[PDB]
Design an enzyme around this catalytic site. Structure first.
Site, PDB file in Angstrom:
ATOM      1  N   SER B 126      54.853  18.443  47.659  1.00 16.30           N
ATOM      2  CA  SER B 126      53.424  18.604  47.528  1.00 16.30           C
ATOM      3  C   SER B 126      52.737  17.632  48.480  1.00 16.30           C
ATOM      4  CB  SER B 126      52.951  18.360  46.106  1.00 16.30           C
ATOM      5  OG  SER B 126      51.531  18.371  46.080  1.00 16.30           O
ATOM      6  N   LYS B 196      58.333  21.701  40.858  1.00 16.62           N
ATOM      7  CA  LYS B 196      57.299  21.984  41.849  1.00 16.62           C
ATOM      8  C   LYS B 196      56.548  23.273  41.520  1.00 16.62           C
ATOM      9  CE  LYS B 196      55.326  23.101  45.855  1.00 16.62           C
ATOM     10  NZ  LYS B 196      53.941  22.737  46.163  1.00 16.62           N
ATOM     11  N   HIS B 199      54.045  22.452  38.890  1.00 19.86           N
ATOM     12  CA  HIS B 199      52.966  21.712  39.543  1.00 19.86           C
ATOM     13  C   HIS B 199      51.919  22.658  40.131  1.00 19.86           C
ATOM     14  CE1 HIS B 199      51.416  20.521  43.479  1.00 19.86           C
ATOM     15  NE2 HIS B 199      51.287  19.299  42.991  1.00 19.86           N
ATOM     16  N   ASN B 200      52.383  23.661  40.878  1.00 20.75           N
ATOM     17  CA  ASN B 200      51.459  24.651  41.430  1.00 20.75           C
ATOM     18  C   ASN B 200      50.770  25.465  40.342  1.00 20.75           C
ATOM     19  OD1 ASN B 200      52.519  23.730  43.815  1.00 20.75           O
ATOM     20  ND2 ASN B 200      52.534  25.765  44.764  1.00 20.75           N
ATOM     21  N   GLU B 203      47.999  23.395  39.122  1.00 15.21           N
ATOM     22  CA  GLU B 203      46.969  23.381  40.153  1.00 15.21           C
ATOM     23  C   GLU B 203      46.081  24.622  40.076  1.00 15.21           C
ATOM     24  OE1 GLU B 203      47.456  24.539  44.856  1.00 15.21           O
ATOM     25  OE2 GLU B 203      48.898  23.181  43.956  1.00 15.21           O
TER      26      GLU B 203
END
Ligand SMILES: [Mg+2]
Ligand SMILES: [Mg+2]
Lengths: 320, 324, 324, 320
Positions: B126, B196, B199-200, B203
């Site tokens: 990221s 990850k 995480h997105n 977001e």
């Protein structure tokens, strides 16, 4: 300047102290005299006066324009104080409501108080040492007058990187100091309300992601589809250089480092009002707001067991 | 250390440059030789060598353990490279996949590569925008042996502790101090791309939370409202004031304030939002795990609907309404 | 019985006709005298009388208890009529509001009218399409005294038990047998419009459930799908087969099958869906009561978004995406 | 016609009985011989044969084209039967899968079985006396051949009002009898899957409305804003002439008449698979599906207490 403060809870008392530390004089009142004396002891030497009632407080405000900041429980208590001040104050005096007031009440109060020439300012705040991010509404005359008080309370520009294209007319430089005149009375509590709605959505986005990661070790999964992930370490690594870095993430990393299982928490979450009022504004404006809505409904459901709707589902299924 | 990099798009080239600036020797390869030479020009001190093929890159790695970092387009292209490396590498060599690979593919690749003793490490990154100078937040999976070996590489790429306030109560067993430097060994292969991916997904939700709030504030001036119920709110100043001392302070907010200061009407954007794989894959994981995920789902559906006109569902609604 | 009706739009006129066909004497009024004469022509056997004003209508009601049914546009118009009747009527007269009034207004009106002993009854109706011949499903609030008095009026308007299978285990105290005839005293004034409001909220959700399913089936042939993952599904036949023996059998499905048989592409509809007050007001009640209502909310938001192009929220999403 | 039936649960046994009552011959098998003998006793005289194994069942199918209907638990058990039949059957024989099979498995099986000339038909059903609403996929040759079996099982046109504009080419008249050839193999289980997704959404719409009405008597409301509403009577009145009249409403009215408080129900609702697979299809197709999504997530959450996401919310709030 001199300002009266009614309501000496955590925020009211801190506001009084920070003002007194920035060269302003405060007149203090709270229903509980022991709280008054605690805050008096916290205020810089001779920067303070204790009042024993609202009339005594107003009598102790000797400036040309009397400024009174109300930081009371929203609702009937705040309304009672506002009406009493309406009786005690006069032309060009200023009443500031710093509570979590429903912004439509701010519109109504400002109109009533204006019939006597009393200016009404709603301040929504988001502390003692770091300053208060503030969104406030009212007339240009009154908000100009109280600008020194708000500048004292605001965080100031600080050490964050400046927003690049800000040097243009139309963009108020005070926003870079952490306090913003949002428009007429009511607009400050309106902007603060939406700030809280956004916060709810951000919190629920994080909460869902951490739930997904925690449940990647679920027994319901086949063992070869599991990962036993370290919640506190994942929160921490995201603090530096990730797209989700944020104050909320910082708090989450601290809570997870303390107790990653979150075993100490019920999961029963209240909604203070701003979430509901944000959704009502969306409805009034025909704006789709599914994320704030999902956040509010998750809070509703967290506080109950299985509810009647879910029982209706079981009943229907059994009827098959 | 010496490391080969195959795939010299924006991220691969930046990673090669930053590695070389931390004193590592990098062997460069990309299907387009002009890209190899562009990236080579950016490396200083002789720490870069241009390879002419994937086998040539492997042949130029002379350390006991060959490390090859794959930074290629998701899908068939990355898979082709991984299979070729399976053929070219041997026991205790290390293959790192830095793309946005579907994490189940990482689990499959690592099991296959273990047949020859080749270690497979998935790295999710990221912060690609500010990454060359500011470092990459990284989430990675693989065996302890291989991830320990490549620790200097990952540390060179990570942001470091920086100057932010430290998180209290981290001095406990179970908590990896490297997390405070911005790179985290997440568990076995696949766990890095899994973290990850989530995480997105988060977001997406944060972005949609802001976007909804800004829509509500912007439409507080709507003609449909009675004039005495309107406020004409300043979007860029509201974004700006929230930057300092508010609960929604965040990197996403910083970007939003910058975009709104540039042009508050957002005139230049259509509003038609694409979605890469990670939002969909996060929702797939929620489903597999029976986890409610209404905010990530709402963000995905908002994106779907932003790309179309009125859809068939809405026409069905109109037909029903006409029916009564 | 004798009853006055003010408001002779589609529903008011149909209600007057059906009442008169069950032998009740109706006194008709509408602001437009041509509408009064159109409705009068539809009444047979001398059971209709045209009034010339609201006071004239009241003057023509000679029973001990005057009953006046108000079937006017929601809002100021209905309120004006109710206030005029407050002035014209007296103790034990009955005012019925049959429009889609916000139920809190019914609570306020009934309290005011009780100052003069005037009873106020709110009637929520469903089934307006087939209502003249098939009857009206009705949900109504008010005092037991007044709702007992007007029972023959409501029974004339209701569908009756019909030929559907009876619900088992209804022979219990607490259960009103009139519910099986399609009209239900819901409780005090306001409760009828409250229940009707929720009925419409549920309808929104059911409609959206169908609309989503039909969108999923229609898009199973999408060009974006790999050719070997497509099905070319027949929407009208799928709607039709579900009519007989399926779990989704319903009046809404019957309408959908009819619309799809007429034109499966739904060519003639834009997809831009309005919402009357009831969906919004149902969600307001959920909020007041802290009840999760995601399906009704999703139906409302789908309607909001169907009426716009890309909105400010989506432009904010695009701006953020460009920012990184 | 003659048909073998493997799997004699509620639906398999009922299907066998209804076939035998409509002039078809059945060959029965189930792992449990007592279930076999119960169904044999329920089948009309001499319309049935009991088999003791899959090979014995196939040997007892003496028609030119062997038809075998599998009504087994989805997953490995159904797959095992399909593979064994793949070994035992031949060119132009027909395998029918009536289970709740994930439709992509139907696509795969049909391709495999076709390599031996064996036709595969997936039937999704939505009983003994009233008939089965059926959505089925397969080749025109095989579905034409088994049309008498499906016509026997379907409800037929019944006494409902006919859909007006149905007399046109392109509209299959068999749909009016309650069974529909949906397209190639897999399309029947696909349509059935979406039928269940719609059903979930309808159920949740009703459940939310009844929750809103039940909670209109909430203590949290001020007494003068309460209504004490009769849930069973409201369900009942909606049965006749309302826009929400439906089979689901009928079931709800029966359950509420029995026990309006729904005190006998937990509210813990499972999701069988079709809900998830419907949402996956929506994702694959880039179709917004918030109602089916909300229905699925309500089911997920009904089965847990407060979950890790909600604990994350409490932890964040405490960190304030
Ligand atoms: Mg995506
Ligand atoms: Mg509405």
């Amino acid at each position: 300047m001199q300002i009266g403060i009614i309501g000496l809870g955590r925020m009211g008392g801190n506001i009084a102290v920070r003002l007194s530390r920035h060269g302003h004089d405060v007149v203090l009142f709270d229903r509980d005299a022991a709280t008054v004396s605690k805050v008096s002891e916290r205020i810089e030497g001779g920067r303070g006066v204790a009042a024993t009632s609202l009339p005594d407080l107003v009598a102790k405000l000797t400036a040309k324009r009397k400024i009174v900041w109300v930081m009371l429980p929203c609702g009937e208590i705040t309304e009672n104080a506002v009406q009493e001040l309406y009786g005690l104050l006069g032309k060009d005096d200023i009443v500031i409501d710093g509570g979590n007031t429903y912004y439509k009440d701010d519109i109504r109060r400002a109109a009533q108080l204006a019939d006597k020439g009393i200016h009404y300012v709603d301040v929504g705040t988001s502390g003692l040492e770091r300053g208060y991010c503030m969104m406030y509404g009212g007339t240009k005359d009154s908000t100009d007058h109280i600008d020194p008080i708000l500048d004292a309370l605001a965080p100031g520009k600080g050490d964050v990187a400046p927003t690049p294209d800000r040097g243009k007319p139309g963009l108020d430089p005070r926003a870079e100091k952490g306090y913003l005149h949002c428009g007429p009375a009511g607009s400050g509590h309106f902007v603060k309300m939406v700030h809280n709605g956004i916060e709810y959505g951000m919190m629920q986005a994080f909460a869902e992601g951490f739930d997904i990661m925690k449940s990647k070790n679920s027994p319901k999964l086949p063992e070869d589809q599991r990962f036993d992930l370290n919640m506190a370490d994942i929160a921490e690594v995201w603090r530096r250089g990730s797209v989700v870095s944020s104050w909320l993430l910082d708090l989450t990393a601290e809570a997870l480092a303390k107790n990653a299982s979150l075993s100490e928490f019920t999961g029963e979450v209240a909604d203070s009002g701003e979430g509901r009022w944000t959704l009502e504004a969306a409805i009034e404006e025909a704006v789709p707001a599914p994320v704030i809505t999902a956040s509010l409904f998750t809070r509703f459901r967290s506080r109950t067991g299985n509810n009647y709707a879910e029982k209706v589902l079981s009943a229907m299924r059994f009827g098959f």
